[PDB]
Design a protein around this ligand. Structure first.
Ligand SMILES: *[C@@H]1O[C@H](CO)[C@@H](O[C@@H]2O[C@H](CO)[C@@H](O[C@@H]3O[C@H](CO)[C@@H](O)[C@H](O[C@@H]4O[C@H](CO)[C@@H](O)[C@H](O)[C@@H]4O)[C@@H]3O)[C@H](O)[C@H]2NC(C)=O)[C@H](O)[C@H]1NC(C)=O
Length: 513
């Protein structure tokens, strides 16, 4: 386990981290702690900082941008969302405080780094009501945001966990699609939204693990109760799919995802997820085409035999097909009976093809025009055949590198494992292990890329790790050098391990003296 020194100490537990790489070779890391946002340059040294709380503090620089104070309740600001809007380009931050409002921070050139212009408060006074708040975006219970450009407008696809206390007034809703106004004063009213019905808010809640935009859709991954009339600890994982091309939630779709250890045993609870295009080797094994986008998920049982963690692969094109087939099953032809529409937490029960709460489909109305849950689940089996054993995976980032696909897995004890993503039987193919300093705190869920390094947080620090694993020069004998994976371009120079270019006449990968 190669020791990795921290690159940045945040002064507090890192709540959120996202990166930016611009067109002009400018880049940045945005790192959020309670009450503070940090901007780092490409060398991961700080260029700027901003006070994001506490609310009703004169020193709160985001709060101050909402105009003459104060704004309440007073309280600490925990950062729930950090997202880039590349169209501007601008960072958007949204906090636990101040009704979940967001702030807009224009990116300005600063050498190879970036600096943020003074914050715009995305909350207009005369525009938000306790019963209707287009600018109430984030929930202290947690929020995922994906930004999609449609023509010359930026839309914010927002999922926010709810309960009764958060929804009472100025509620953020469950799923929404909000247009950011060009004058930076807020989001456009009239946005569309689904949320957990007040009657269900009492006992039913939804966690949002991940969100991403690929092809014509925005996808959210969720953990929630298997059923609305069921123990709120019988949890499972769902994929929610929304149109990325129209700002509408009529055809919102969910699909239950089922990963199992099957040498089988279900691992119903999603811990962390990442999607990425796969290399040719894994593509062949999954029967898809090289470079196809695959959604990878780390699952746990959520509570004897079996690994602590499994990793399942769900190719995006197959998920979309399963969903399309689910729609036809609900809405086509003669529908088979007893097929539920579902999403009872968002809408009234009904059976396909009827609209929520109804027993007939009227001729002026379309079955597909209402949200539905796909009737059968998508089941996959652990790519790693239980080989992660007792390891508790807390973070995941997948990178394609020619034919090879690598998983970079963060652990509960502060390690990174890099493993080739293949269907494994008897052993895992480790590229490299890292330790992140030696607090051994958990690796935080959210992993960012910067150039050819990945950034991971644990505790109050950010670390960088090479995507390709350690340089060839770290292999000190010929056998070791030649044991290195293909993709690294390591070859023995005679007394030295290097790339071809360091010993053009002797570089070889073939055998040892
Ligand atoms: C990166 O990180 C991984 C830590 O999770 C680590 O993986 C573990 O490595 C250890 C040491 O090799 C593995 O322990 C072996 O497991 C199998 C069990 O069948 C055995 O081959 C093996 O042989 C022996 O076990 C004997 C007991 O019968 C023991 O006395 C000997 O000492 C001998 O080791 C070990 O039991 C462990 O299973 C691996 N775990 C997992 C979850 O994969 C990697 O080594 C490390 N990789 C790199 C490239 O750095």
């Amino acid at each position: 386990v190669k020791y990795v020194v921290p690159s940045f100490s945040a002064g507090g537990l890192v709540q959120a981290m996202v990166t930016y790489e611009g067109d002009r070779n400018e880049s940045a890391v945005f790192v959020a702690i309670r009450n503070r946002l940090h901007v780092l340059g490409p060398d991961l040294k700080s260029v700027q900082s901003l006070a994001t709380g506490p609310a009703g503090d004169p020193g709160c620089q985001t709060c101050a941008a909402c105009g003459p104070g104060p704004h309440g309740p007073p309280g600490d600001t925990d950062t729930k969302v950090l997202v880039l809007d590349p169209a501007l380009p601008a960072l958007v931050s949204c906090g636990s405080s101040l009704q979940g409002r967001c702030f807009l921070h224009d990116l300005e050139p600063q050498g190879t780094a970036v600096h943020l212009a003074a914050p715009a408060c995305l909350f207009s006074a005369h525009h938000n009501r306790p019963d209707d708040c287009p600018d109430c975006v984030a929930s202290p219970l947690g929020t995922r945001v994906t930004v999609v450009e449609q023509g010359q407008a930026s839309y914010f696809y927002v999922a926010s966990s709810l309960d009764a206390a958060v929804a009472a007034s100025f509620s953020p809703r469950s799923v929404s699609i909000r247009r950011l106004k060009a004058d930076a004063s807020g989001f456009a009213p009239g946005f569309v939204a689904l949320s957990v019905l007040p009657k269900h808010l009492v006992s039913y809640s939804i966690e949002y693990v991940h969100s991403f935009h690929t092809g014509a859709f925005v996808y959210f991954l969720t953990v929630q109760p298997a059923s609305v009339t069921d123990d709120p600890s019988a949890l499972h994982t769902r994929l929610a799919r929304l149109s990325a091309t129209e700002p509408e939630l009529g055809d919102y779709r969910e699909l239950v995802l089922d990963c199992r250890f099957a040498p089988g045993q279900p691992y119903p609870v999603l811990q962390v997820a990442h999607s990425a295009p796969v290399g040719a080797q894994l593509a062949t094994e999954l029967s898809i085409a090289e470079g196809q986008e695959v959604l990878f998920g780390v699952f746990v049982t959520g509570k004897g035999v079996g690994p602590n963690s499994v990793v399942c692969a769900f190719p995006i094109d197959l998920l979309d097909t399963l969903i399309d087939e689910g729609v036809e099953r609900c809405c086509e032809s003669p529908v088979h009976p007893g097929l539920r529409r579902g999403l009872d937490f968002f809408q009234s029960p009904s059976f396909c093809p009827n609209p929520p709460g109804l027993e007939a489909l009227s001729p002026n109305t379309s079955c597909r025009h209402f949200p539905l849950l796909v009737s059968s689940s998508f089941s996959r089996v652990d790519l790693f055949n239980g080989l992660l054993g007792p390891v508790q995976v807390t973070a995941l980032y997948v990178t394609r590198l020619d034919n090879v696909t690598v998983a970079h897995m963060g652990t509960m004890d502060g390690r990174i494992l890099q493993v080739e993503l293949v269907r494994s039987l008897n052993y895992l193919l480790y590229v490299s292990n890292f330790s992140l300093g030696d607090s051994g705190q958990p690796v935080q869920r959210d992993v960012s890329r910067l150039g050819d390094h990945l950034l991971f947080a644990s505790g109050d620090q950010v670390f960088q790790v090479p995507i390709q694993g350690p340089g060839c020069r770290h292999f000190l004998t010929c056998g070791r050098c030649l044991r290195a994976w293909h993709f690294m371009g390591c070859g023995w120079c005679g007394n030295m391990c290097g790339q071809q270019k360091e010993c053009p006449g002797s570089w070889q990968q073939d055998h040892c003296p």
